[PDB]
Design a protein around this nucleic acid. Structure first.
Ligand SMILES: [Cl-]
Ligand SMILES: [Cl-]
Ligand SMILES: [Mg+2]
Ligand SMILES: [Mg+2]
Ligand SMILES: [Mg+2]
Ligand SMILES: [Mg+2]
Ligand SMILES: [Mg+2]
Ligand SMILES: [Mg+2]
Ligand SMILES: [Mg+2]
Ligand SMILES: [Mg+2]
Ligand SMILES: [Mg+2]
Ligand SMILES: [Mg+2]
Ligand SMILES: [Mg+2]
Ligand SMILES: [Mg+2]
Ligand SMILES: [Mg+2]
Ligand SMILES: [Mg+2]
Ligand SMILES: [Mg+2]
Lengths: 50, 120, 119, 153, 203
RNA sequence: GAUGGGGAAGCUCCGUUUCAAAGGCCUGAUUUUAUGCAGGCCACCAUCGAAAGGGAAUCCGGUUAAGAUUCCGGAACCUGG
RNA sequence: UUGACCUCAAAUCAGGUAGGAGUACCCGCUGAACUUAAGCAUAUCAAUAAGCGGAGGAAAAGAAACCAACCGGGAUUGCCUUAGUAACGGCGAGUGAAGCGGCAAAAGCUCAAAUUUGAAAUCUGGUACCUUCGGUGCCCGAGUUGUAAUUUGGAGAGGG
């Protein structure tokens, strides 16, 4: 997997940037109902099936 | 009589081929330069590790467009900053961006160019 | 802040290209300052000005091409009307109104008359 | 190539097999000397050209429209009659003095009955060689039939 | 003119003259491709009465079609059902071979419209047809009042929907008591006769 | 696994040099201009298929919190022009 | 030798066109079984589901090679009715239209087959210009192996 195609690495980059908690100022908006990041992914729990 | 044919194989004869002379243009407005100097060089990288190379190795670190190759990066650096480039090394970072290590020739100092740009 | 489209339209293409280069230099300079300051909202104004200048340049270049093809039966496809694919394949008004000489004579001789049941 | 080979084998196949008399009569064509004499007479009655028709109309317009003529300021034309439908009608009305028949018509049914029609109507006919040659005297690429109805004294 | 003689002579197919012509022509067709362009109609009289005109925009194509029944395409003949449906060999295709010829020519020239077709020749293996095609993009057709109806989008792929003369024959589109099942479409008639109609005030 | 072809109502199937008019680099000819025009050459006739098969060419020393036969210093080699 | 014709090719030749999607409704092809018959094979489910090809704002059908047997009606489509009827069916289970009558909506038509023959009178394209969903002039080409005008059965045509 060290020798990887560009398609695999590009999707790996996208998953890396999405692995963050919810920004705090989102909860302070008017009529906000989002409490947490429901799509959080961790490498030890669910695989990407890429 | 008849033409003398020394070969029993018949082949397609060669006929005149004309070049295109369109009645109207395909797009009528050429697109501008898709990768100019300001698009090849996006912004300098100013992490602590990158700053050491500027002071020590005479190397400037830049974030560049994913579509730019080493020829375009060298040409852009010379035109934007009026310097000379010895060689360029590039890599694709884990976040999907391209980083270029640009080493200047001995006639130029990477430190005084870096603060001329504004970053330190 | 920002450029005005109506002001740009009163300028030639030589000085429109120069302004585009000047804005590109300014945008690059602001990117360096963004790496040291906590926030820098001025970056958005320069980007929109670059978009506005490119729009005005494109309008002038396309308009000059329209004058070059004025009256000619063939024009570039990007300068033709869009409509839909089906509408562009339909018969024109002239073609859809064609009749034979046999039918034209009948129409002139016996048209739909106007009448009323009064007396 | 395939189109060349199919072209030569069809010629062979049409003579290897027996040919019925209705089709076999077209193997006899007018000889060189008589055909040359025939075309000399037919060349004297060429149809008017498009350019020549231009002069007649502009002369006729300047003659009858302003001169109050009876549309008869021009002499009666003499020309070779052509057209398969036109010529067949002329033969059925006993108006053709001589009919030329081409032996090269690939859809042969178009012309296969003409010798019998001419024979029954009493119109002399000749099977001449070359449909392209007949077209030359009617300003066409191909004519496949030609006829004379009225000839100068 | 000569068209009248052509019509009557074509009906004597077993005369000595026509037997000779049909033998030499059936060989010539077999040496060409299954579908190929024809420079001119081989039966100009027959083409005219089907709507053909000798002007730019009219195209003639020739096509051969295999004869015989339609074998059921099942592996090894097994049908996996009741014995009433176990037939394999004596089954007949509901469309004619003439219809099949038009369909394959239609796909070959998808920029054209199929007008009509007619029989020309046959042997033990193939039946031969010539298909009449009209170009809906040519200005000679779009400006022609008698033929610009074909340019309407409702007439695209007439042979695919059985709107040609051979298509309407196989659909049973005729008048009279003999065509009660297929007067105005077999499936539409079946829907009408199998529909329960209820009104607001029940009858 | 395309094409040329032949099957199949059809989605598609067969077949891989096949019943095909299947193509281009050595120049000469030209100083209107770019390559039209003369000999001859060659008929091989798509493409995909290996990070363990075949295959042009790099080594030592040093350096980072985390990279290196890729960076630094020194010393070589191959291909194209 | 040269110039035509016919047929067949080539070009990143000039200008166009086809594919895919959607698919409730529409036009065709192909095509079951569960089920019912208190078993079951014909039958039934059903000329249905699934599969495949092709359209539109509607589609299809349509101006009789019709219905009738009457004092006759008069293109097509839909509604009410005819009618669970005539008829079909191991005449078992089951299946099953049509003419008339009332109504909604109403609309008619054109090619082939004839010599313009004292005049291919017809048409694509190119080009210049203009009043540009087109028009005029000019020039090639298509076409007599038939393009216009004229006539479609209710008629109609050539003469007086
Ligand atoms: Cl990795
Ligand atoms: Cl017709
Ligand atoms: Mg690298
Ligand atoms: Mg295959
Ligand atoms: Mg490979
Ligand atoms: Mg390591
Ligand atoms: Mg082209
Ligand atoms: Mg049972
Ligand atoms: Mg039971
Ligand atoms: Mg059972
Ligand atoms: Mg279905
Ligand atoms: Mg639509
Ligand atoms: Mg409606
Ligand atoms: Mg319709
Ligand atoms: Mg009628
Ligand atoms: Mg009725
Ligand atoms: Mg039933």
């Amino acid at each position: 997997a060290a020798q990887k195609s560009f398609r695999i690495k590009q999707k790996m980059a996208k998953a890396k940037k999405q692995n963050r908690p919810l920004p705090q100022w989102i909860r302070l908006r008017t009529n906000n109902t989002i409490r947490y990041n429901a799509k959080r992914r961790n490498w030890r729990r669910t695989k990407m099936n890429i | 009589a008849l033409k003398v044919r020394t070969s029993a194989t018949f082949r397609l004869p060669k006929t005149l081929k004309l070049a295109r002379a369109p009645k109207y243009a395909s797009k009528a407005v050429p697109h501008y330069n898709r990768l100019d100097s300001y698009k090849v060089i996006e912004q300098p990288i100013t992490s602590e590790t990158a700053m050491k190379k500027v002071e020590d190795g005479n190397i400037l670190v830049f974030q560049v467009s994913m579509k730019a190759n080493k020829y375009q990066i060298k040409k852009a650096v010379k035109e934007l900053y009026e310097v000379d480039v010895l060689k360029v090394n590039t890599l694709v970072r884990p976040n999907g961006t391209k980083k270029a290590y640009v080493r200047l020739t001995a006639d130029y100092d990477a430190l005084d160019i870096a603060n001329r740009i504004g970053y330190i | 802040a920002g450029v005005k489209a109506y002001e740009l339209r009163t300028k030639s293409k030589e000085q429109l290209a120069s302004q585009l280069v000047d804005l590109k230099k300014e945008l690059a300079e602001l990117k360096v300052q963004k790496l040291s300051r906590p926030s820098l909202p001025k970056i958005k104004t320069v980007r929109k000005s670059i978009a506005c200048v490119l729009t005005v340049i494109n309008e002038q270049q396309r308009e000059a091409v329209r004058q070059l093809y004025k009256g000619k039966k063939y024009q570039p496809k990007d300068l033709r009307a869009k409509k839909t694919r089906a509408l562009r394949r339909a018969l024109t008004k002239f073609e859809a109104s064609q009749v034979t000489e046999k039918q034209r004579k009948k129409q002139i001789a016996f048209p739909q008359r106007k009448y009323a049941i009064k007396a | 190539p395939e189109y060349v080979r199919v072209q030569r084998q069809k010629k062979i196949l049409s003579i290897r097999l027996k040919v019925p008399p209705t089709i076999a009569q077209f193997q006899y064509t007018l000889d060189r000397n008589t055909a040359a004499e025939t075309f000399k007479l037919f060349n004297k009655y060429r149809p008017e050209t498009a350019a020549e028709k231009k002069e007649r109309l502009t002369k006729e317009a300047a003659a009858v429209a302003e001169g109050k003529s009876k549309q008869d300021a021009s002499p009666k034309p003499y020309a070779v009659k052509y057209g398969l439908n036109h010529v067949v009608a002329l033969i059925e009305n006993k108006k053709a003095k001589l009919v030329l028949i081409a032996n090269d018509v690939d859809p042969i049914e178009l012309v296969v009955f003409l010798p019998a029609l001419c024979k029954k109507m009493g119109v002399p006919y000749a099977i001449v060689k070359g449909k392209a040659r007949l077209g030359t005297l009617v300003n066409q690429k191909t004519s496949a039939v030609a006829a004379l109805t009225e000839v100068r004294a | 003119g000569a068209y009248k003689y052509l019509e009557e002579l074509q009906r004597k197919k077993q005369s000595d003259v026509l037997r000779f012509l049909q033998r030499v022509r059936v060989w010539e067709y077999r040496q060409k491709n299954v579908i190929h362009r024809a420079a001119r109609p081989t039966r100009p009289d027959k083409a005219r009465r089907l709507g053909y005109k000798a002007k730019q925009g009219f195209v003639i194509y020739r096509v051969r079609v295999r004869r015989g029944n339609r074998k059921r395409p099942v592996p090894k003949g097994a049908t996996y059902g009741k014995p009433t449906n176990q037939g394999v060999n004596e089954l007949k295709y509901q469309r004619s071979l003439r219809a099949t010829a038009e369909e394959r020519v239609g796909r070959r020239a998808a920029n054209l419209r199929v007008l009509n077709s007619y029989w020309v020749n046959q042997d033990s293996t193939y039946k031969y047809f010539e298909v009449i095609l009209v170009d809906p993009q040519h200005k000679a057709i779009r400006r022609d009042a008698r033929y610009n109806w074909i340019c309407d989008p409702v007439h695209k792929h007439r042979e695919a929907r059985g709107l040609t003369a051979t298509g309407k024959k196989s659909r049973g589109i005729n008048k009279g008591h003999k065509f009660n099942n297929t007067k105005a479409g077999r499936r539409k008639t079946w829907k009408r006769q199998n529909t329960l109609s209820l009104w607001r005030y029940r009858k």
